[PDB]
Protein backbone atom coordinates (compact mmCIF):
# COMPACT_ATOMS: atom_id res chain seq x y z
CA UNK A 250 0.00 0.00 0.00
CA UNK A 251 1.06 3.58 -0.77
CA UNK A 252 0.47 5.72 2.30
CA UNK A 253 -1.66 8.89 2.47
CA UNK A 254 0.09 12.25 2.67
CA UNK A 255 -1.28 15.63 3.77
CA UNK A 256 -1.46 18.77 1.61
CA UNK A 257 1.78 20.09 0.07
CA UNK A 258 3.30 23.50 -0.62
CA UNK A 259 5.46 22.98 -3.71
CA UNK A 260 9.19 22.94 -2.92
CA UNK A 261 8.43 23.02 0.80
CA UNK A 262 6.46 19.77 0.75
CA UNK A 263 4.59 19.44 4.09
CA UNK A 264 6.95 21.64 6.12
CA UNK A 265 4.69 24.67 6.41
CA UNK A 266 2.08 22.49 8.17
CA UNK A 267 4.42 22.59 11.21
CA UNK A 268 4.58 26.38 11.03
CA UNK A 269 1.96 26.81 13.77
CA UNK A 270 1.65 27.36 17.54
CA UNK A 271 0.22 23.87 18.06
CA UNK A 272 1.94 21.40 15.72
CA UNK A 273 1.06 18.27 17.69
CA UNK A 274 -2.60 19.19 17.76
CA UNK A 275 -2.36 19.93 14.02
CA UNK A 276 -0.84 16.49 13.40
CA UNK A 277 -3.63 14.83 15.43
CA UNK A 278 -6.22 16.44 13.15
CA UNK A 279 -4.24 15.26 10.12
CA UNK A 280 -4.24 11.72 11.57
CA UNK A 281 -8.01 11.96 12.04
CA UNK A 282 -8.40 12.68 8.31
CA UNK A 283 -5.83 10.26 6.92
CA UNK A 284 -5.85 7.35 9.37
CA UNK A 285 -3.26 5.11 10.98
CA UNK A 286 -0.21 6.14 8.93
CA UNK A 287 0.86 9.09 6.81
CA UNK A 288 4.04 10.28 5.13
CA UNK A 289 5.34 13.70 6.12
CA UNK A 290 7.94 15.30 3.87
CA UNK A 291 10.18 18.33 4.29
CA UNK A 292 13.10 19.62 2.24
CA UNK A 293 15.84 17.09 2.87
CA UNK A 294 13.86 14.60 4.96
CA UNK A 295 10.90 12.27 5.42
CA UNK A 296 9.16 10.60 8.35
CA UNK A 297 6.00 8.56 8.78
CA UNK A 298 3.44 9.30 11.47
CA UNK A 299 1.86 6.28 13.21
CA UNK A 300 -1.44 6.41 15.14
CA UNK A 301 -2.77 2.84 15.51
CA UNK A 302 -1.94 0.18 18.10
CA UNK A 303 -1.72 -2.23 15.20
CA UNK A 304 1.25 -0.44 13.65
CA UNK A 305 2.79 0.98 16.83
CA UNK A 306 3.12 -2.49 18.33
CA UNK A 307 5.52 -3.24 15.47
CA UNK A 308 7.35 0.08 15.74
CA UNK A 309 8.04 -0.92 19.34
CA UNK A 310 9.93 -4.07 18.26
CA UNK A 311 13.47 -3.30 19.45
CA UNK A 312 14.94 -5.92 17.13
CA UNK A 313 13.57 -3.87 14.20
CA UNK A 314 13.55 -0.23 15.40
CA UNK A 315 15.75 1.86 17.72
CA UNK A 316 15.27 5.37 19.17
CA UNK A 317 15.94 8.20 16.72
CA UNK A 318 16.84 11.74 17.73
CA UNK A 319 14.19 14.09 16.32
CA UNK A 320 15.34 17.42 14.93
CA UNK A 321 14.03 18.79 18.25
CA UNK A 322 16.10 16.51 20.50
CA UNK A 323 19.08 17.31 18.27
CA UNK A 324 18.72 21.02 19.01
CA UNK A 325 18.26 20.25 22.71
CA UNK A 326 21.46 18.22 22.61
CA UNK A 327 23.32 21.54 22.36
CA UNK A 328 22.84 21.95 26.11
CA UNK A 329 21.77 18.45 27.25
CA UNK A 330 24.77 16.84 25.53
CA UNK A 331 24.99 13.06 25.77
CA UNK A 332 22.71 12.96 28.79
CA UNK A 333 20.35 9.96 28.77
CA UNK A 334 17.49 11.56 26.81
CA UNK A 335 19.58 13.10 24.02
CA UNK A 336 22.03 10.23 23.44
CA UNK A 337 21.91 7.52 20.75
CA UNK A 338 21.55 3.94 22.01
CA UNK A 339 24.92 3.12 20.44
CA UNK A 340 26.91 5.83 22.25
CA UNK A 341 29.07 4.43 25.04
CA UNK A 342 27.70 6.99 27.50
CA UNK A 343 24.09 5.91 26.98
CA UNK A 344 24.55 2.34 28.22
CA UNK A 345 27.02 3.45 30.91
CA UNK A 346 24.71 6.11 32.39
CA UNK A 347 21.67 3.85 32.00
CA UNK A 348 23.30 1.07 34.04
CA UNK A 349 24.62 3.49 36.66
CA UNK A 350 21.36 5.42 37.10
CA UNK A 351 18.71 2.66 36.92
CA UNK A 352 19.17 1.80 40.65
CA UNK A 353 18.41 5.44 41.57
CA UNK A 354 14.86 4.54 40.57
CA UNK A 355 14.53 1.27 42.48
CA UNK A 356 11.90 0.64 45.11
CA UNK A 357 14.47 1.10 47.84
CA UNK A 358 15.02 4.39 45.98
CA UNK A 359 11.57 6.02 45.81
CA UNK A 360 11.36 5.22 49.52
CA UNK A 361 14.50 7.29 50.05
CA UNK A 362 13.10 10.26 48.08
CA UNK A 363 9.69 10.17 49.77
CA UNK A 364 10.52 12.46 52.68
CA UNK A 365 11.86 15.25 50.44
CA UNK A 366 8.90 14.96 48.06
CA UNK A 367 6.68 15.58 51.09
CA UNK A 368 8.84 18.59 52.00
CA UNK A 369 7.92 20.29 48.71
CA UNK A 370 4.30 19.03 48.69
CA UNK A 371 3.70 20.54 52.12
CA UNK A 372 5.02 23.88 50.83
CA UNK A 373 2.41 23.66 48.06
CA UNK A 374 -0.42 22.91 50.50
CA UNK A 375 0.65 25.72 52.86
CA UNK A 376 0.72 28.21 49.97
CA UNK A 377 -2.87 27.35 49.10
CA UNK A 378 -3.93 27.31 52.78
CA UNK A 379 -2.59 30.88 53.09
CA UNK A 380 -4.62 32.39 50.23
CA UNK A 381 -7.20 35.05 51.14
CA UNK A 382 -10.98 34.74 50.57
CA UNK A 383 -11.51 35.27 46.83
CA UNK A 384 -8.00 34.68 45.51
CA UNK A 385 -7.37 31.91 42.97
CA UNK A 386 -4.67 29.50 41.88
CA UNK A 387 -2.62 29.54 38.68
CA UNK A 388 -2.39 25.77 38.30
CA UNK A 389 0.42 24.92 35.89
CA UNK A 390 2.48 27.77 37.35
CA UNK A 391 2.21 26.28 40.84
CA UNK A 392 2.60 22.68 39.61
CA UNK A 393 5.86 23.73 37.92
CA UNK A 394 7.08 25.27 41.18
CA UNK A 395 6.42 21.91 42.86
CA UNK A 396 7.92 19.60 40.22
CA UNK A 397 11.04 21.71 39.67
CA UNK A 398 11.74 22.00 43.39
CA UNK A 399 11.11 18.28 43.92
CA UNK A 400 13.68 17.18 41.32
CA UNK A 401 16.18 19.79 42.49
CA UNK A 402 15.92 18.59 46.10
CA UNK A 403 15.43 14.82 45.70
CA UNK A 404 17.94 14.72 42.87
CA UNK A 405 20.78 16.89 44.15
CA UNK A 406 19.95 18.44 47.53
CA UNK A 407 19.49 21.83 45.85
CA UNK A 408 16.60 24.13 46.79
CA UNK A 409 15.31 26.31 43.94
CA UNK A 410 12.91 27.76 46.53
CA UNK A 411 10.27 28.31 43.84
CA UNK A 412 7.50 29.05 46.35
CA UNK A 413 9.47 32.02 47.71
CA UNK A 414 9.37 33.66 44.35
CA UNK A 415 7.05 35.44 41.93
CA UNK A 416 9.32 35.11 39.00
CA UNK A 417 11.42 32.17 37.80
CA UNK A 418 14.75 30.94 39.11
CA UNK A 419 17.49 32.31 36.82
CA UNK A 420 17.90 28.66 35.72
CA UNK A 421 14.47 28.27 34.12
CA UNK A 422 14.87 31.69 32.52
CA UNK A 423 18.12 30.46 30.95
CA UNK A 424 16.54 27.04 30.34
CA UNK A 425 13.12 27.94 28.91
CA UNK A 426 14.72 30.49 26.60
CA UNK A 427 17.17 27.82 25.44
CA UNK A 428 14.36 25.33 24.78
CA UNK A 429 12.50 28.23 23.12
CA UNK A 430 15.49 28.95 20.91
CA UNK A 431 15.84 25.19 20.40
CA UNK A 432 12.23 24.75 19.26
CA UNK A 433 12.34 27.88 17.10
CA UNK A 434 15.16 26.52 14.90
CA UNK A 435 12.59 23.97 13.68
CA UNK A 436 11.28 26.38 11.02
CA UNK A 437 14.13 28.76 10.18
CA UNK A 438 23.54 36.65 9.70
CA UNK A 439 20.15 38.16 10.52
CA UNK A 440 20.43 35.67 13.37
CA UNK A 441 23.71 36.45 15.13
CA UNK A 442 21.90 37.79 18.23
CA UNK A 443 19.87 34.82 19.51
CA UNK A 444 23.13 32.86 19.53
CA UNK A 445 24.55 35.03 22.29
CA UNK A 446 21.44 34.79 24.39
CA UNK A 447 21.70 31.05 23.75
CA UNK A 448 25.39 30.69 24.66
CA UNK A 449 24.78 32.85 27.76
CA UNK A 450 21.77 30.79 28.88
CA UNK A 451 23.89 27.70 28.33
CA UNK A 452 26.62 29.28 30.46
CA UNK A 453 24.15 29.89 33.30
CA UNK A 454 23.12 26.23 33.63
CA UNK A 455 26.62 24.74 33.42
CA UNK A 456 28.34 27.01 35.95
CA UNK A 457 25.70 26.37 38.61
CA UNK A 458 25.63 22.59 38.09
CA UNK A 459 29.43 22.42 37.83
CA UNK A 460 29.65 24.07 41.25
CA UNK A 461 26.73 22.00 42.53
CA UNK A 462 29.01 19.07 41.64
CA UNK A 463 32.52 19.90 42.88
CA UNK A 464 30.87 21.50 45.90
CA UNK A 465 29.54 18.05 46.82
CA UNK A 466 32.68 16.20 45.69
CA UNK A 467 34.93 18.21 48.02
CA UNK A 468 32.90 18.43 51.24
CA UNK A 469 32.59 14.71 50.59
CA UNK A 470 29.29 14.82 52.48
CA UNK A 471 27.53 11.46 52.57
CA UNK A 472 24.36 11.06 50.52
CA UNK A 473 22.50 8.50 48.50
CA UNK A 474 20.60 10.70 46.04
CA UNK A 475 20.84 10.94 42.23
CA UNK A 476 23.95 13.11 42.33
CA UNK A 477 25.54 10.64 44.72
CA UNK A 478 25.13 7.89 42.13
CA UNK A 479 26.27 10.08 39.21
CA UNK A 480 29.43 10.81 41.27
CA UNK A 481 30.28 7.45 42.92
CA UNK A 482 28.54 4.81 40.81
CA UNK A 483 30.30 2.32 38.53
CA UNK A 484 28.81 0.69 35.42
CA UNK A 485 28.94 -3.09 36.14
CA UNK A 486 29.58 -3.64 32.47
CA UNK A 487 32.61 -1.47 31.65
CA UNK A 488 33.54 -1.05 35.33
CA UNK A 489 33.76 2.71 34.66
CA UNK A 490 32.07 5.68 36.40
CA UNK A 491 30.66 8.68 34.52
CA UNK A 492 33.05 11.59 33.99
CA UNK A 493 32.33 15.14 35.14
CA UNK A 494 31.23 16.36 31.70
CA UNK A 495 28.56 13.69 31.34
CA UNK A 496 27.56 14.07 34.98
CA UNK A 497 26.62 17.70 34.34
CA UNK A 498 24.66 16.79 31.22
CA UNK A 499 22.74 14.24 33.29
CA UNK A 500 21.82 16.87 35.91
CA UNK A 501 20.68 19.28 33.20
CA UNK A 502 18.75 16.41 31.61
CA UNK A 503 16.99 15.36 34.81
CA UNK A 504 16.21 18.91 35.94
CA UNK A 505 14.43 19.44 32.64
CA UNK A 506 12.97 15.98 31.97
CA UNK A 507 12.37 15.71 35.70
CA UNK A 508 9.67 18.39 36.08
CA UNK A 509 8.05 19.75 32.89
CA UNK A 510 6.07 16.65 31.90
CA UNK A 511 5.22 16.05 35.51
CA UNK A 512 3.79 19.56 35.97
CA UNK A 513 1.78 19.05 32.82
CA UNK A 514 0.39 15.78 34.17
CA UNK A 515 -0.72 17.31 37.45
CA UNK A 516 -2.31 20.25 35.58
CA UNK A 517 -4.27 18.04 33.19
CA UNK A 518 -5.34 15.73 36.05
CA UNK A 519 -6.78 18.63 38.09
CA UNK A 520 -8.45 20.00 34.93
CA UNK A 521 -10.17 16.70 34.16
CA UNK A 522 -11.19 16.37 37.81
CA UNK A 523 -12.93 19.76 38.03
CA UNK A 524 -14.63 19.07 34.66
CA UNK A 525 -15.94 15.74 35.96
CA UNK A 526 -17.13 16.31 39.58
CA UNK A 527 -18.29 12.70 40.16
CA UNK A 528 -14.74 11.56 39.40
CA UNK A 529 -13.28 14.28 41.68
CA UNK A 530 -15.63 13.12 44.46
CA UNK A 531 -14.59 9.46 44.09
CA UNK A 532 -10.91 10.43 44.19
CA UNK A 533 -11.46 12.77 47.17
CA UNK A 534 -13.16 9.92 49.06
CA UNK A 535 -10.11 7.70 48.57
CA UNK A 536 -7.76 10.45 49.70
CA UNK A 537 -9.75 10.98 52.89
CA UNK A 538 -9.95 7.21 53.52
CA UNK A 539 -6.23 6.53 52.96
CA UNK A 540 -4.35 9.61 54.15
CA UNK A 541 -5.12 9.31 57.89
CA UNK A 542 -1.95 10.98 59.16
CA UNK A 543 -0.84 14.66 59.00
CA UNK A 544 1.59 13.73 56.21
CA UNK A 545 1.45 10.74 53.79
CA UNK A 546 3.66 7.67 54.20
CA UNK A 547 5.21 5.90 51.22
CA UNK A 548 2.91 2.93 51.90
CA UNK A 549 -0.14 5.23 51.95
CA UNK A 550 0.75 6.73 48.55
CA UNK A 551 0.88 3.18 47.14
CA UNK A 552 -2.68 2.67 48.36
CA UNK A 553 -4.10 5.62 46.39
CA UNK A 554 -5.19 3.27 43.58
CA UNK A 555 -8.00 5.45 42.14
CA UNK A 556 -5.75 8.52 42.21
CA UNK A 557 -3.25 6.43 40.22
CA UNK A 558 -5.98 5.57 37.71
CA UNK A 559 -6.95 9.24 37.41
CA UNK A 560 -3.33 10.00 36.54
CA UNK A 561 -3.17 7.25 33.90
CA UNK A 562 -6.42 8.48 32.31
CA UNK A 563 -4.95 12.02 32.16
CA UNK A 564 -1.85 10.55 30.47
CA UNK A 565 -4.10 8.70 28.03
CA UNK A 566 -5.83 11.83 26.78
CA UNK A 567 -2.92 14.26 27.04
CA UNK A 568 0.48 12.52 27.32
CA UNK A 569 2.80 15.42 28.11
CA UNK A 570 5.69 14.21 25.98
CA UNK A 571 3.34 13.51 23.07
CA UNK A 572 5.65 11.95 20.48
CA UNK A 573 8.80 9.88 20.02
CA UNK A 574 10.91 9.06 16.96
CA UNK A 575 12.36 5.74 15.72
CA UNK A 576 14.51 4.49 12.83
CA UNK A 577 14.56 1.13 11.04
CA UNK A 578 17.62 -0.96 11.98
CA UNK A 579 17.40 -2.91 8.71
CA UNK A 580 15.11 -3.13 5.69
CA UNK A 581 11.76 -4.49 6.92
CA UNK A 582 8.03 -4.51 6.09
CA UNK A 583 5.66 -2.58 8.37
CA UNK A 584 2.19 -4.06 9.00
CA UNK A 585 2.59 -6.35 6.02
CA UNK A 586 2.07 -3.55 3.48
CA UNK A 587 4.61 -0.77 4.01
CA UNK A 588 8.18 -1.61 2.92
CA UNK A 589 10.82 0.33 4.85
CA UNK A 590 14.51 0.79 4.18
CA UNK A 591 17.27 0.74 6.77
CA UNK A 592 17.37 4.18 8.38
CA UNK A 593 13.77 5.20 7.55
CA UNK A 594 12.16 7.22 10.35
CA UNK A 595 8.84 6.74 12.15
CA UNK A 596 7.06 9.10 14.55
CA UNK A 597 4.72 7.72 17.23
CA UNK A 598 1.85 10.18 17.76
CA UNK A 599 0.92 9.12 21.29
CA UNK A 600 -2.30 11.12 21.76
CA UNK A 601 -3.70 9.47 18.59
CA UNK A 602 -2.60 5.99 19.71
CA UNK A 603 -4.45 6.62 22.99
CA UNK A 604 -7.62 7.36 20.95
CA UNK A 605 -7.54 4.15 18.89
CA UNK A 606 -11.19 3.01 19.11
CA UNK A 607 -10.34 -0.63 18.31
CA UNK A 608 -8.57 -0.67 21.66
CA UNK A 609 -10.48 1.70 23.92
CA UNK A 610 -14.00 1.60 22.44
CA UNK A 611 -16.10 4.46 21.05
CA UNK A 612 -15.99 6.69 24.14
CA UNK A 613 -12.28 7.57 23.75
CA UNK A 614 -12.84 11.30 24.38
CA UNK A 615 -14.49 10.71 27.78
CA UNK A 616 -12.47 10.93 31.04
CA UNK A 617 -13.12 7.59 32.74
CA UNK A 618 -10.34 6.44 35.11
CA UNK A 619 -12.16 3.13 35.57
CA UNK A 620 -10.71 2.05 32.17
CA UNK A 621 -7.61 1.26 34.18
CA UNK A 622 -9.27 -1.11 36.64
CA UNK A 623 -7.71 -4.14 35.12
CA UNK A 624 -4.40 -3.17 33.43
CA UNK A 625 -3.72 -6.77 32.30
CA UNK A 626 -6.61 -6.37 29.85
CA UNK A 627 -4.72 -3.74 27.82
CA UNK A 628 -3.04 -5.15 24.69
CA UNK A 629 0.74 -4.71 24.25
CA UNK A 630 1.95 -1.22 23.28
CA UNK A 631 -1.51 0.32 23.46
CA UNK A 632 -0.64 2.79 26.26
CA UNK A 633 2.76 4.43 25.89
CA UNK A 634 2.97 7.78 27.73
CA UNK A 635 6.50 6.86 28.91
CA UNK A 636 7.94 5.68 25.59
CA UNK A 637 9.33 2.25 24.77
CA UNK A 638 11.74 -0.52 25.75
CA UNK A 639 15.23 0.24 26.99
CA UNK A 640 14.73 3.85 25.84
CA UNK A 641 11.56 4.24 27.94
CA UNK A 642 11.34 6.94 30.64
CA UNK A 643 13.83 6.14 33.40
CA UNK A 644 11.93 8.62 35.62
CA UNK A 645 8.48 6.98 35.30
CA UNK A 646 8.25 5.74 38.89
CA UNK A 647 9.53 9.05 40.25
CA UNK A 648 7.00 11.06 38.23
CA UNK A 649 4.04 8.88 39.22
CA UNK A 650 4.95 8.76 42.91
CA UNK A 651 5.32 12.53 43.09
CA UNK A 652 2.07 13.11 41.20
CA UNK A 653 0.09 10.59 43.26
CA UNK A 654 1.40 12.02 46.57
CA UNK A 655 0.68 15.63 45.59
CA UNK A 656 -2.76 15.02 44.06
CA UNK A 657 -3.67 12.89 47.07
CA UNK A 658 -2.79 15.73 49.46
CA UNK A 659 -4.60 18.27 47.26
CA UNK A 660 -7.80 16.23 47.31
CA UNK A 661 -7.49 15.64 51.06
CA UNK A 662 -7.05 19.31 51.93
CA UNK A 663 -9.27 21.36 49.57
CA UNK A 664 -12.49 21.47 47.61
CA UNK A 665 -12.01 22.92 44.11
CA UNK A 666 -14.04 25.34 42.01
CA UNK A 667 -13.76 25.84 38.23
CA UNK A 668 -14.69 29.47 38.85
CA UNK A 669 -14.04 30.69 35.29
CA UNK A 670 -15.54 27.71 33.44
CA UNK A 671 -12.05 27.37 31.98
CA UNK A 672 -11.87 26.63 28.24
CA UNK A 673 -9.06 24.16 27.59
CA UNK A 674 -6.20 25.79 25.66
CA UNK A 675 -3.14 23.56 25.16
CA UNK A 676 0.18 25.36 24.83
CA UNK A 677 2.91 23.41 23.06
CA UNK A 678 6.57 23.65 23.91
CA UNK A 679 8.43 20.37 23.77
CA UNK A 680 5.66 19.28 26.12
CA UNK A 681 1.96 20.09 26.58
CA UNK A 682 0.06 22.01 29.24
CA UNK A 683 -3.31 23.69 29.81
CA UNK A 684 -2.38 27.38 29.53
CA UNK A 685 -4.22 29.83 31.79
CA UNK A 686 -5.92 27.10 33.81
CA UNK A 687 -7.05 28.55 37.14
CA UNK A 688 -9.18 27.29 40.02
CA UNK A 689 -10.29 28.34 43.49
CA UNK A 690 -9.52 26.07 46.43
CA UNK A 691 -11.63 26.03 49.60
CA UNK A 692 -9.78 24.62 52.61
CA UNK A 693 -11.34 21.69 54.49
CA UNK A 694 -9.33 22.95 57.47
CA UNK A 695 -7.34 19.75 58.03
CA UNK A 696 -4.04 20.56 59.76
CA UNK A 697 -0.64 19.23 58.68
Ligand code: HEM
Pocket residue numbers: 316333334335347400502503506507508510511514568569570572573574634635636637639640641642643644645647648
Ligand atom coordinates in the same frame (compact mmCIF):
# COMPACT_ATOMS: atom_id res chain seq x y z
C1 HEM B 1 4.63 12.38 33.45
C2 HEM B 1 5.94 12.65 33.45
C3 HEM B 1 6.85 12.16 32.31
C4 HEM B 1 6.53 11.73 31.09
C5 HEM B 1 5.12 11.68 30.44
C6 HEM B 1 7.76 11.34 30.42
C7 HEM B 1 7.88 10.86 29.13
C8 HEM B 1 9.02 10.32 28.57
C9 HEM B 1 9.11 9.70 27.27
C10 HEM B 1 7.94 9.50 26.27
C11 HEM B 1 10.37 9.31 27.07
C12 HEM B 1 10.90 8.62 25.79
C13 HEM B 1 11.56 9.72 24.94
C14 HEM B 1 11.93 9.32 23.53
O1 HEM B 1 11.69 8.14 23.16
O2 HEM B 1 12.47 10.17 22.76
C15 HEM B 1 11.15 9.69 28.24
C16 HEM B 1 12.49 9.48 28.45
C17 HEM B 1 13.24 9.90 29.53
N1 HEM B 1 12.78 10.53 30.68
FE1 HEM B 1 10.73 10.86 31.11
N2 HEM B 1 8.81 11.55 31.29
C18 HEM B 1 8.29 12.03 32.47
C19 HEM B 1 8.98 12.35 33.62
C20 HEM B 1 10.34 12.21 33.80
C21 HEM B 1 11.09 12.45 35.02
C22 HEM B 1 10.50 12.91 36.37
C23 HEM B 1 12.39 12.21 34.76
C24 HEM B 1 13.60 12.30 35.73
C25 HEM B 1 13.44 12.30 37.05
C26 HEM B 1 12.51 11.79 33.38
C27 HEM B 1 13.70 11.46 32.77
C28 HEM B 1 13.83 10.84 31.55
C29 HEM B 1 15.08 10.39 30.97
C30 HEM B 1 16.51 10.51 31.58
C31 HEM B 1 14.68 9.77 29.63
C32 HEM B 1 15.61 9.12 28.59
C33 HEM B 1 15.92 7.73 29.15
C34 HEM B 1 16.84 6.96 28.24
O3 HEM B 1 16.67 7.10 26.99
O4 HEM B 1 17.73 6.24 28.76
N3 HEM B 1 11.23 11.80 32.83
N4 HEM B 1 10.27 10.31 29.14
